[PDB]
Amino acid sequence: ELFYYTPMMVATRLLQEQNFTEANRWLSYIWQPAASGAGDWRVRPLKED
Amino acid sequence: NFVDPTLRTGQTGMMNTMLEQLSQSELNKDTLENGFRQYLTAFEQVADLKVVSGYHDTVNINQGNTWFIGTSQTEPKKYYWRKADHSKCQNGRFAAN
Amino acid sequence: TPDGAQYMEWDGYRTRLNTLFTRQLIERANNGIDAILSPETQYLPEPK
Amino acid sequence: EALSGEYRSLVMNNPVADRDDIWRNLLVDGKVSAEITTTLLADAIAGIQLYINRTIAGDEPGADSDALERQFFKDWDACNKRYSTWAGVSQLVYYPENFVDPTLRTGQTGMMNTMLEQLSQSELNKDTLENGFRQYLTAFEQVADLKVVSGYHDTVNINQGNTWFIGTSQTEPKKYYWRKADHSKCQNGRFAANAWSDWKEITCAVNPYGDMVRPVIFHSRLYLLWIEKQVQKDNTGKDTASFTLKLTHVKYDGSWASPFSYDITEKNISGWKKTGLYCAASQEDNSLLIAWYQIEKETQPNSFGLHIQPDMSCKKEPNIAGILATVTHQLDTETTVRVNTLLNRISSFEFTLEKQEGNKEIDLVISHGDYTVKTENSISALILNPTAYINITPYKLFSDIPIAQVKTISSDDISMEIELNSTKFETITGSDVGLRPPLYPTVSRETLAFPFGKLSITIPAGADINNLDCTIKVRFKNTDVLAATTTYKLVIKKTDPVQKVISLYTTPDGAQYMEWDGYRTRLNTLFTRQLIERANNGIDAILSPETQYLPEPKPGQGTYVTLILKPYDKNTHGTNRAFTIYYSNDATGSGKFPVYSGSLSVTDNTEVKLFIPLIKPQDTLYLNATYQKEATKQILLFRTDNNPEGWTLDKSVNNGTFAGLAENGVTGLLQSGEPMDFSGANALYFWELFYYTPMMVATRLLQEQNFTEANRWLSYIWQPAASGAGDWRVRPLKEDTSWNADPLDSVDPDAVAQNDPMHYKVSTLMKLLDLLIARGDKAYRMQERDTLNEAKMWYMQALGLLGDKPVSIFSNGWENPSLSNAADKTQAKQFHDEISRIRSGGLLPDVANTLTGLFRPQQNEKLLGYWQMLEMRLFNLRN
Amino acid sequence: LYINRTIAGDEPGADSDALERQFFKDWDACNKRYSTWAGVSQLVYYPE
Amino acid sequence: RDTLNEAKMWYMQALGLLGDKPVSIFSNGWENPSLSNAADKTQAKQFHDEISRIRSGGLLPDVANTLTGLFRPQQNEKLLGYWQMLEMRLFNLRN
Amino acid sequence: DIQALIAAEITGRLPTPDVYNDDNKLVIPAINTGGKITFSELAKTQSD
Amino acid sequence: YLSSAILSTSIGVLDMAAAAADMAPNIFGVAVGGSRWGGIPKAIGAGMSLAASATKITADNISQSEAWRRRRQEWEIQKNNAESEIRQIDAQLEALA
Amino acid sequence: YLSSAILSTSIGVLDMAAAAADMAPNIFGVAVGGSRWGGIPKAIGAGMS
Amino acid sequence: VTLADFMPMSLAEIRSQNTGRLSREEAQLLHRAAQKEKQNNILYTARMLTRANPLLKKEMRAEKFVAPGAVSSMFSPAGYLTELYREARGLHPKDSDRNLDKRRQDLAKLVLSQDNLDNEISALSLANEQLETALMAQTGKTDKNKYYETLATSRRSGVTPYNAPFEGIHNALAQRNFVLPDNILSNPAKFAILAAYDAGISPKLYNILTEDTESLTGSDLENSLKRNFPKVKIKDLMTLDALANYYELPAD
Fold first, then answer.
1. Taking a contact as any Cβ pair under 8 Å apart, which residues of chain D between 452 and 471 contact chain C?
2. String of DSSP letters for D283-320
3. Is F7 exposed, middle or buried (0-12, 13-18, 19+ CB in 10 A)?
4. Phi and psi for J122 in degrees, rounded to 5?
5. In this structure, are residues D442 and D402 in contact, taking their beta carbons and an 8 Å threshold?
6. Contact call for C and G: 3+ CB–CB distances under 8 Å
7. Among D379, D646, D746, J107, whose CB has the most other CB atoms within 10 angstroms?
């Protein structure tokens, strides 16, 4: 909950009511694009499935 | 396609009472940080819980359930309870559900 | 165990009941939400 | 279509490739219709924005990762991605008054918020707006009555760290609050005004005995702690008293936990007198050393100790008399109060960063993360960083699966081998970590990590702990094909910085001050004891500038000296136009404290005022000055009597001239009461009362259209004078007083306006322009004749405030540069080099052409909008 | 217009003591306009 | 105008996340079966037999043709909706 | 509107079509700091 | 509403003084005592709950004033509708003339 | 409204500490006692309400 | 000079260079010093620039202010483009083909002016110019119309056998609602070519679609595949994405 569902809830709650530049920050706590082609997952069990 | 980050089964009371406070329209940084700090307070309280004592359900401890009683790190103490389902416990490893 | 963790010891197994993440989030969380949800917080150790 | 096909038929040599590949490769969109038109620079902007987005998302392989970990690209998506949110953020430093809001401010106190709650209705008559102000002034009185009881300093070096305080209120029962004093913004013993947190109420119920309250920090969480006495009676005719330690702390949401309890009384503390406690953290075996101790003229004949775990369980220490003998410069006496610091590590570690690196392609960087000792052994925690970049020869360079080297498996590849005095212990990451950093991300300059979790190294055997525990080396070794080792020397040693005493005192006429190394800092203020007579006459007497000139007693024994200095000489000041100016005690050679630093001026005397305290217990003082030429001689300041103000005028045999003061006048001695400070600890409350509350009420009356009262509330701050210049009635706007040293660590116009209060002048003037244009529009919409002349006189008053319309130059020294020439790295290096030269006063400017660099500054677009708005209104009036 | 320009500092040389007067101290609220001059002067003679 | 170029760079970032549009095959190993032949009980018995064999690692797969049985899996219709949505937005941008 | 004229006279092409035609000379302006216009002239020898 | 909020905030002082007076013992003689050791946290809790009621009252005050301001804005729209309809009917009368 | 809800939840801690302090006796001497045996359920009820 | 060069660099950039000289901690201390000095320098220049505000001219470096929308401004799109190009031109190395300076040789040449900021051009014409300046540089010919004449006959894509004169004839003649083979004034023995021009078919495309490619064996098959596909690999063209992109029709 702390590391995935709370940023998911806040991001989907800011996508509603159109706070996009903060919703992208809260989505960037979990997923953030990397210099390589693969994405960088910042939640540990999504890096380690 | 059908997952919802708002509504989840088994969603705790902490997530629910944070979603209550983020359900207004004006979501600035201050509201959305105060709600997160209150969530983190409740998370601290449910993570401070040391298990006092328990009761296993059946006689074969490979099967059945195990209830526990955990106390909080306050004064006075707030006693809580879980349940550990041994029917999902293979190789001595509990699944997370 | 004398450094904080608890475990239920049955037939040939042990299962960690609690966790000591809450005693070590306390220093990370002063720096803010950005330090809480960092992946170094998720790599945090826990006694055997 | 045809040229796009023939391009990759010929240039790219891949006719299979998509047409959108030519937009990905060539940054110009091809499938656009012929009617979509753009400017040329906007097409270059869109092309380079597409390039940045494709190289930041991984669709452009080969990018420099270190250039992408940069504040331009770390703040790409929020700020720098679009032209609009680049311009709107870059203007927030140069024009904060466009984005300042008198309603919403960061760091706004609860008093201002609960006043803004009550002024948020529509009917704002004089009675509502006076009752809200009196309630605000009540809360202001309560937060200004706060005397600081006791404190806790964070670190051991008191030049660094933080200092928490506990202040009580002047009520019964008492309401304990807390601040925080950030020593990282404390240069020359002078706290900046943003180095103080606000007061904040400790909501828990705290009932001490003998004024025993100490805060304490345990893993960055404020814990409060006190001893509570409970009067009881024995089963016999006698009557005892049970003592109880209590311990609360903050939670994450600002709340306070329920206090715990620990039984104290064992037959001795009931027999003590005037006693007090001690509590502080411990860097070794992390706990809270609690200690209550009997007092005399000398400290601690008897004491009893207690440890508190993170479990928050009691743990009775059998001996603190060996411990407090190392602390007793922080323990109080019968007459002193001393803020405590954390207990030291008994041994401090140091690490020599190099002996031999071996193969220089990999940097082989360790970093000693954690380091302690337990009761019998020395543990460590290490991470390891290689380079692992391009041009590992030979090449393919097609694919890596994580004659040449081992591109595959990196099991057991790196290994730490500590050498003891006679033995060694070689661990290895194959014996530690199953997590394996792959060489793919093969794209260059990607560095790796190798964490060692809590390497407990056993055992120091037969070593004098810790007298000669200088142990020879500590070595790791990356062992792979073409990899090397480097080794480190531990320099571990027991230390004791002796008696760096920090203390609290109160002068007998009311003020309090924290006295540390060579400085004093006034904690409270006595403005609340003298507003009480002014405030009976009303709001008009509170916000008068004579209230802002109100005096305040000098902190303890000390003198004021105001020093007039000569204008700049190339000879006697060296090459640096700046200076710093010290004082000492001075048994010569005892060190001298920097009390002031500044930049001396040309063609003008500079007058710098000081307060030189008397800390040292003919009580002598001495002052010096440091230039780029040399350092100056001392100037004695003694006194023969116990009269506080007298400190002999241009004192004995020494001439009393630095060579840079150039006057017969030095003195500045008298007037013990300095004026009230708007840069001290109580700065925010004064700034709120005298600026932000009239700003909030004025912008709250401009809304809902109470103009004739909004102009009165704007006239508490700004009021036009008989001379051409305006008269500013708020003191730090008359005396432009910076009260925020570091404003650019956050995205807010408020902090930038707090660093330079001229933006508060322009904010007030823009609110008054808003007021005048609103009154003129209200008169204009009443379309009768005399009210139209009213409209004209209001808009002419607004034009009188603005003045002459600034003619925008177009014929300019702006050449039309190349974009390669416009974006040279030297062109910003030379710019910041020159400004960093002139800001330190390294020498004179050459005289004064390029203060902005290549791109010229522009006028404020909002103010130019006021110009065009007034011109349109008055054109419609004249027709 | 003359009073506004000499009260705002755009007319240098003005007598400052004549400007510290109850007609000009109460200029902006009451005495600046005909309407709020008449409506204040009538409040003594016709309070009803 | 500049906000339309902003719109184009956002939709191109979304297309960069999605990637290459998956071409739906129609020429296929799908014969046209009889409904009696499509609903044989052996046709599900053999399917779950093979998957229960390979899930316990009873031996290697034969190598790897039918992992779904008779009926082929389909793409997510929501994601294909994102594809068509972005393509329509960017077509309206380019005109 | 007169600054646009002077600017288009120095950096644009005004007076159209031909300039420089007063006894093989020319006077071109040069404004500075928004409040002054200074001058500088041109001449030539007799080729052709 | 504003007077009710100020009454609901000017009350914790005296409610705190009550718990201050309760701390002294009142049973005297041979049996000694009678203090109320939890009286001060009861007073701080009454102060918090009463400040919460006060800030809910002032929130309702702001809500009423904002509802009335939106009501005036709707009246302004209806006023401008009827005022444009007058000008339309007058131009229509001129066309009929 | 959100600040009022947070004040109305941050209060049962201290209201519980009140009932904790009431459990100790306060009449001393020959007559001994004075505890409030129902104070803790009163505190939990105040917290629930 | 000392910490002025280290202002635009990141912490990883500072740590990346002088690996033997700078340690890991000294690089962090140097980075903090350079960023704080950058902040204080820009505060200093904002303090000197806010004294020239016309609301404060009664109370008083007023060198040069420019209009909003001027190209000389520090908030202009020219300043944004300068910031963007300066942060962009070092992401890929100069050897690489994905470098910004190598794939676009017009940006370093590009001049910042008020005319470039204000004037509007057709973006499609700019794309056409950007492709022409590469194709004519590949073929070496400097003329334009000579290149469209040698492009009139070429077959090296699915879009290439076209004549811009013939497309001009077809567009202008269809905009008159005029039909070529339905005239009174025509050769009825030349109805086929006239109808092929009516549907709009280049004469080289007519020579492609005229060929008797069916029933053609031997080395003449190799010659016809070499003519009708000069540049592609046929084995690379066999996939469906290549047949979608090469003829510029959707793969569906």
1. 453-454
2. SSS--EEEEEEEESSSEEEEEEEEEE-TT--EE--S--
3. middle
4. -75, 125
5. no
6. no
7. J107
